[PDB]
Design a protein around this ligand. Structure first.
Ligand SMILES: [Mg+2]
Ligand SMILES: [Mg+2]
Length: 113
């Protein structure tokens, strides 16, 4: 795939998890099959976050985790939202069911193994 992608799909204990990097890029209006199109970030050093404005280009409803403990946010099909990726992690964990944010820690640990 192109270098611009930063996206992993994996199965864990019977459910699928999408791990989205804060540096994922798919150009809006790409002719390729797109999943999370949107421009590159707001990167303000005064902020503990990097913000990405992305569209969910699918028929999936996601619960999105960027830290733990946290209540997830909900990302419906075709909607454009701003995700606040934490500078600590620079990933978001996406699931199609309401998981507990402890799932985030599982992937955060694995990122640096
Ligand atoms: Mg890449
Ligand atoms: Mg925390």
């Amino acid at each position: 795939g192109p270098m611009a992608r930063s996206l992993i799909k994996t199965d864990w204990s019977g459910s699928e998890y999408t791990i989205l990097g804060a540096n994922h890029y798919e150009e809006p209006n790409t002719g390729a099959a797109a999943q999370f199109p949107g421009t590159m970030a707001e990167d303000d050093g005064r902020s503990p976050y990097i913000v990405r404005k992305l569209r969910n280009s699918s028929g999936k409803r996601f619960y999105v985790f960027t830290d733990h403990p946290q209540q997830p946010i909900i990302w419906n099909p075709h909607e454009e939202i701003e995700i606040q990726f934490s500078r600590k992690y620079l990933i978001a964990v996406l699931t199609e069911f309401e998981a507990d944010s402890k799932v985030f820690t599982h992937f955060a640990r694995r990122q640096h193994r």
